[PDB]
Amino acid sequence: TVFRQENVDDYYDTGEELGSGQFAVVKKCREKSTGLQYAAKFIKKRRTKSSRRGVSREDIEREVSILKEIQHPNVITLHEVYENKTDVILILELVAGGELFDFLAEKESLTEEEATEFLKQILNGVYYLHSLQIAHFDLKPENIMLLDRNVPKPRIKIIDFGLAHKIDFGNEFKNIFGTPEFVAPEIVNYEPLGLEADMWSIGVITYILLSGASPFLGDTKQETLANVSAVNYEFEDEYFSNTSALAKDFIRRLLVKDPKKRMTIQDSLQHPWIKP
Ligand SMILES: c1cc(-c2ccnnc2)ccn1
Ligand SMILES: [Cl-]
Structure with a gap:
């Protein structure tokens, strides 16, 4: 499955970082056309079929396929998906109150x-x-x-x-x-x-x-x-x-x-x- 390949910066402005992991970084963003805010998750793609760095396309597609199915008050939802040569970018619902981990x-x-x-x-x-x-x-x-x-x-x-x-x-x-x-x-x-x-x-x-x-x-x-x-x-x-x-x-x-x-x-x- 292919995703939107226009530059995400043409449609969104990014702000503060909301998370950082092994193969993904999350940034707060704002959609220019609506002013609505989201969390943009940038997932690094694999650069070669035998590489151990980055996420395989199969794994990225599975995550996207699951996210597209869900709509419930207690689960994050997916707004849109973009991609370029280095990343797949998930535009997700913004959850701005922090991790339960930090609250605890x-x-x-x-x-x-x-x-x-x-x-x-x-x-x-x-x-x-x-x-x-x-x-x-x-x-x-x-x-x-x-x-x-x-x-x-x-x-x-x-x-x-x-x-x-x-x-x-x-x-x-x-x-x-x-x-x-x-x-x-x-x-x-x-x-x-x-x-x-x-x-x-x-x-x-x-x-x-x-x-x-x-x-x-x-x-x-x-x-x-x-x-x-x-x-x-x-x-x-x-x-x-x-x-x-x-x-x-x-x-x-x-x-x-x-x-x-x-x-x-x-x-x-x-x-x-x-x-x-
Ligand atoms: C804020 C943060 C996040 C987040 C943070 C870290 N990893 N994945 C998603 C998702 C939605 N809103
Ligand atoms: Cl997430």
């Missing part, structure tokens, strides 16, 4: 109600995606963005569909691997992956939201991965002494090694800690 760093830990306020929105977004057979595969606080961080109950949007895949056969078996602290055991063990991997990630996020601590984090990535595979985590009393047993139950039912025994997104929404 500025509060240490959340109350259960604050945590469930965020978590219910994450679950709603993932319910939508999973309903579409879309596995995100990179859920973590850095990939949750607030619309406005200066309100009592911030609204959030899931971003960064760079690892997302359609699961039309129940599982996929490709080169997929996210951030060690948040990946499920099946990712660590290079097993077939499905929608269940995201539910594990939600369990990790929930643990962090309630404690300010990462459940499997080791001193090295390899140690973290080993901890994940062994399900080596516990609820430290210092952090969870006044956390409800039902909150712990929710987490426990997500941080399950066997993906078939892990709570599904529908299960999570009916769990007594979440269900209204």
Whole structure:
């Protein structure tokens, strides 16, 4: 599939940087014709078929294909796509309230109600995606963005569909691997992956939201991965002494090694800690 090849600078003005990764940079921008603001994600293309730098066209097209399908209050949307010889440029919905990661760093830990306020929105977004057979595969606080961080109950949007895949056969078996602290055991063990991997990630996020601590984090990535595979985590009393047993139950039912025994997104929404 080909994208718009006019110079993006002819239609948009760019401003402050909103993100920077291994193969992508995000800049705030403004569409000249409407005055509306967006986030322009510049994804570096591969310069040769055997290169390890840049993102393959197949991977870029997959991300775009998934983004084009989604429209939900808790997921980022795609406005337009441009490309040139060096980059594919996604013009995405602007989410200007910063990462959930940074908001958490500025509060240490959340109350259960604050945590469930965020978590219910994450679950709603993932319910939508999973309903579409879309596995995100990179859920973590850095990939949750607030619309406005200066309100009592911030609204959030899931971003960064760079690892997302359609699961039309129940599982996929490709080169997929996210951030060690948040990946499920099946990712660590290079097993077939499905929608269940995201539910594990939600369990990790929930643990962090309630404690300010990462459940499997080791001193090295390899140690973290080993901890994940062994399900080596516990609820430290210092952090969870006044956390409800039902909150712990929710987490426990997500941080399950066997993906078939892990709570599904529908299960999570009916769990007594979440269900209204
Ligand atoms: C603000 C920032 C972003 C963002 C930041 C970092 N990585 N991907 C998207 C997307 C939308 N709005
Ligand atoms: Cl994004």
